[PDB]
Amino acid sequence: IAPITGTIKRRVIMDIVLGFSLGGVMASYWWWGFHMDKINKREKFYAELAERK
Amino acid sequence: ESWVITEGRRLIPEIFQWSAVLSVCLGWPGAVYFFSKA
Amino acid sequence: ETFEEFTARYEKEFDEAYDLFEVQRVLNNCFSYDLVPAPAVIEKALRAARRVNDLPTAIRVFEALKYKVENEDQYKAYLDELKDVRQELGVPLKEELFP
Amino acid sequence: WLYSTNAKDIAVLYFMLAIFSGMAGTAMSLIIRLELAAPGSQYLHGNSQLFNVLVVGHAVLMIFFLVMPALIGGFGNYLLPLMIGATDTAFPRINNIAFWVLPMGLVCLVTSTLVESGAGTGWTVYPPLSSIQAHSGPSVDLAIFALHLTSISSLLGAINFIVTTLNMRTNGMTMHKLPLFVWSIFITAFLLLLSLPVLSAGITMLLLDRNFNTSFFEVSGGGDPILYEHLFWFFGHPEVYILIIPGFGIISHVVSTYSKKPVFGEISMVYAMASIGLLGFLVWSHHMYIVGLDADTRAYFTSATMIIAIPTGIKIFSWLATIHGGSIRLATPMLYAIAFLFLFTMGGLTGVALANASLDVAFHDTYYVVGHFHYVLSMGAIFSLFAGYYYWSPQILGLNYNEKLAQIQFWLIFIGANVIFFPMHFLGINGMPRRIPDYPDAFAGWNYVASIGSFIATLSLFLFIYILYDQLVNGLNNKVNNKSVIYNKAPDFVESNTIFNLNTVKSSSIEFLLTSPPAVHSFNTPAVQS
Amino acid sequence: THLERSRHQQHPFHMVMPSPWPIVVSFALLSLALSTALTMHGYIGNMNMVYLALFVLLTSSILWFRDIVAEATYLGDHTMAVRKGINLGFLMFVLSEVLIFAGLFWAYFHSAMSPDVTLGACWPPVGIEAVQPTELPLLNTIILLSSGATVTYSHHALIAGNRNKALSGLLITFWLIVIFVTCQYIEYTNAAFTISDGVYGSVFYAGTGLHFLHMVMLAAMLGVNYWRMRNYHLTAGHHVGYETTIIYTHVLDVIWLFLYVVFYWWGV
Amino acid sequence: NKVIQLQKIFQSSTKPLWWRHPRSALYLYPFYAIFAVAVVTPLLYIPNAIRGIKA
Amino acid sequence: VHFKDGVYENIPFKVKGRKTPYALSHFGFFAIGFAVPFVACYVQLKKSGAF
Amino acid sequence: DVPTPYACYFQDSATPNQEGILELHDNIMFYLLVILGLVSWMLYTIVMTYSKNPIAYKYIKHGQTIEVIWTIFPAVILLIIAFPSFILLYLCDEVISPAMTIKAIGYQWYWKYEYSDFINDSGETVEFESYVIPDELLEEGQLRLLDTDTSMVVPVDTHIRFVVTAADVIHDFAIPSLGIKVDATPGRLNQVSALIQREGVFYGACSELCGTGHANMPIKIEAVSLPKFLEWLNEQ
Amino acid sequence: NSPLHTVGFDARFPQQNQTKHCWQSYVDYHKCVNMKGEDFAPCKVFWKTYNALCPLDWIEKWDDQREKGIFAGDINSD
């Protein structure tokens, strides 16, 4: 005997925040492995235009 | 003791399968470019 | 509202069941809540099936109890607790019947 | 029969025309996408006319002759009499002119192409492009009249729905307790009323500037063509919030029927559904960010059309709350209503990216817009039209539709139209302009990817004709064998099979308690509720 | 008893027989719109098919209306709710026809609120001379303020029960409106600027142009409100064909006063 | 005056309501004459309007 | 349709009891609706030189 | 610049006005992948894990403690994301201190620039059209419908200020590598101010429809150096 | 070094639509040549302005509407 309660409440908080943690591992790669990768090239080439003096 | 190992096993092959959906639902142009660059 | 007001309300409604319909429509919403029902109210869910002379609505109690138990460890301790009133009425379970 | 004033038999004529105008509205989009298969004019020989004619010939059959007469006419003239508790509509004699001007709205449009010029003006019929010095013949003369016949049918087709809901209910049906499909159209009827007379002046003034030379819009005379860009688009953004609010009514019934559960926050779903309709009025120049508005006027709209994403988030997260606990019965209306919840919302994220004035200046008239508005038209207003037909087809016709064959029509629509409209975001982020028969050679990449898919979706539509053939011929021999699904609500876990046939339909609406098909007088006594 | 109750209708709302004038008006709206776009581009030679299209349409309205008065006074499913159905179906309708003026008021605030370059820097521009509000346009406001004081002087008079004020009070209101057609015929015959007079010539014969195109149907609405009250059709406890005429004119005081303040007072 | 008189004729007439007026026989056959011409002659000029033959 | 709420009698079709098979009159309504732009691509090309 | 076959991103940023768009298109889509990451997850935990739930929890309707949470949640990202969207609007009308004025007028099938600033010693404007080269006159190696015959030269590191209008049908003026897009209204005119920061040719397109010849109107523009531009201006 | 020179901000017309900037500088130049003529150097700041930011067909138009007296703007200050 045990007054077990909260099977859906433990499957909403576990359910929401593991989508926010799944909304980060697709977005923090998109802003670092793609966006900062794209700003790496434009910071490089514009530094190879200021070299010409 | 219940929701520490039974809530896990329902969810370990789920995210192993859920990412396989988005790599086909959204990642499918990463194959037609790969197959025929010509 | 609470666990105890859940128990006292549905163990009361099983008494004025009087029919097969008002067992299954009340066994339904005694299982379709967020929480898990106590064995005090499910004892009147087998006595309600004995008052209406229908056995598979007493075998479907222990199958609705099996899916909505959320742990097998919390089921065998829950099964052995009900074995005092499950051997009088002779209610089998679906796995022992092998239908 | 032809001129019977029964509201049931008018809505079956509405639906008989919205597929005929559908198989014409998508045969034009077949030739449009066939021409974008390769650089150089392939099938059209060298003609850049009859491509701005076919684009306007296709985009107005889809908006005004498919999604308008089905979600408002084909369903609203069948369900709003039935679910509320009326016997038929409140004005049943003008209920017949609201259909029979629509084939006359077709003869005013198919003959607008067969004449010598061809209206190559685009769907947004702009004034100096459509002026008489530019377009000379009677082609655009009829294309601004077929848009007027539909403007006048769907105007009195919404006066028919404000004095049906407000007085012609049953006994206990108070104003807070209605089906959400009625609150879809009754909210829509307060947008059809308050945006179509704005349009009817914005077209007749263009008629006056073409054969009566009054110069409302003529540049020689000070008449702006930029007045048109805020007067047509004052109709235009409420118009695209009218193709989606009855789309928000069908989904709220399907997703809470095939899940055995009432909808989450019903009172929260009716206040965030007029707030879409009310605040949709106050945002109408987000289409025209680049046309030279002020630096604070664009600063207002870049904050004001993002607030349309406030009540739409309520109307989506509650559809992700009304199926969390409950069961899921994956039949065909549940498949459409669960892929509507993924492809319409991805057409919403592209909405708030376009919504900014600081970012529309690199996206206007590109193909990134056409990637955005097709995720919310062919995936938000066809995904709720297929989920409304399949949800009420055997209840209304009386015959079941070969459920094993309607699942393959869903997937060929899902993945066979996502292959078209997903690479459009890539051609537009480079900057391919719209309405062009040919393009630079670097845009031949995805335009062959999006060309292989228009044969996939229009092969599913050829299959959907056969489902309509299997439903009318031996559609009675479907529910006596194992072809279809009969009961859309399977019984509960502790509900015995022999007691289910006594209490079969546990609906929350009158629409299923009626017979299949419903009677010619399905209400000859005032029904009572609670 | 119940035997007569099984011989009658059990719901107050009206059921109509299948009439064919639904597809008659639809065929007229085809031959209106198709034929008005042909004679602008030839293919006929003469401009009388539009005159035909204004004749077959308007006789189709009265044959529609002859069946309605056959239901209004000769068959009669007009209960309290059905009386409230049309009385709200028309009060919500004129919200649409007061918003079409906002499709024409807003053009006047598009060429005068911000001055343009093709015209002058003043509104009304040079070469264009406007009529002051201290002239015959001020007769047009007082003749409707006198109309707004005689449409309610005969509104309650029909309910009052005497026919000396109810019948004669609507003939004096009908000729108060035909005389309003002729004073808006002076500025259509004596004013300097025309319909093709640029943007001031465009919107001035549009905002006041559509206000002239409603008196042809309002006087035609009095043309049956006097014929029916002489042929004893209308009653003093149930009148829909008389009530829609008063709300056609009691809102007309509001829109003409908003039309007079910006076209003439603010328009000089 | 004729409101009770027509009410005997309109109620229990067993006719279509647009044939239920006593002054309605002459209202239709000239009306069906102008209806039989106004829906063909705007459409018969359409093959004349396809070949450029205008007036 | 005024009366006879049967099974096939709320539709203005004639499904059963037709003299000709129904697939003639059903595909012949939806393929005719499919072949109307293919005559707008005919009389506007042949008029404008192309074929 | 030049579009790339099978590409999926912006053209290369050659303007700080264009460079601001790329840091706002990625600032927005970072907050769009959390929302797409939520919906794609919260729809797979329901179709898979709850299609095998035969007992429907049909007594959870209101939810007052989660009703108020997801109505401030679109009111907490939008209040954040608008502050990089307000800083781009009020800092892209910087026409304070310009250095050059060039024109661009489109007559429905071409453009017509004029360099009416009279820094050139001849004291006359240099007007020249911009026709696309047809396929019959196509020199082998030219980009089809993207390469005109008479191009346009602009200096680098200079505060230019366009004026864009037309005398006929509306059609806009779009170079995606510089972030310039204005309507060319017939009755009025519009300006943009785009400092170019690298030498190279940019190709663009005309976006808004004009008529039959909408595909036959490119906007070719190359950036040269300021002495190298002046050697072109003293010639023509 | 920096030989280029053009019209500055013109804060009374700070928006994107600079059409009244093209119109009024045509006005303020031709109102200067008839009234209060003592020099040309503060009078050519309105000449050097409207040569910029104005099309050539418009200046051909504004010099043709001025010639028949059909100039819609006030051209004669005197």
Ligand code: HEA
């Ligand atoms: C209701 C709106 C609607 C719908 C559904 C569609 C559907 C489609 N549209 Fe269209 N389209 C527009 C509205 C719509 N379109 C508009 C407004 C424009 C812009 C014009 C302009 O501004 O220039 C446009 C433009 C447009 C372009 C040109 C882009 C540009 O120049 O701007 C292209 C080309 O790819 C295109 C293709 C398609 C395709 C392949 C479909 C496919 O989805 C169609 C095939 C899929 C189906 C099989 C489903 C539909 C079929 C039915 C019959 C409906 C089913 C309903 C019932 C039978 C119950 N559309």
Ligand code: HEA
């Ligand atoms: C038919 C349906 C439809 C719908 C519903 C919408 C909805 C929206 N549309 Fe779209 N739109 C069109 C159809 C539609 N649109 C058409 C046909 C065009 C013009 C094409 C043409 O001219 O030819 C157009 C054009 C158009 C433009 C003009 C671009 C251009 O021409 O330059 C813009 C830009 O502002 C825009 C934005 C939006 C926005 C912000 C919404 C928003 O309502 C959507 C918001 C929804 C959500 C965001 C998703 C759900 C919510 C959440 C999960 C929670 C909240 C979200 C977050 C916090 C990020 N639309």
Ligand SMILES: CCCCCCCCCCC(=O)OC[C@H](COP(=O)(O)OC[C@H](O)COP(=O)(O)OC[C@@H](COC(=O)CC)OC(=O)CCC)OC(=O)CCCCCCCC
């Ligand atoms: C303008 C309007 C044009 C309209 C044209 C559209 C044409 C679409 C036609 C679709 C169709 O009719 O299919 C339905 C038909 C009946 O199915 P049912 O629902 O009664 O259940 C059957 C049972 O449950 C399982 O059937 P079973 O498994 O026993 O048969 C195997 C079947 C499955 O394979 C396929 O579906 C693809 C080949 O394979 C074959 O039969 C191959 C025989 C050559 O199933 C079939 O037998 C299809 C046979 C192939 C037909 C040609 C396919 C072309 C793509």
Ligand code: CUA
């Ligand atoms: Cu000029 Cu498109």
Ligand SMILES: [Cu+2]
């Ligand atoms: Cu919009």
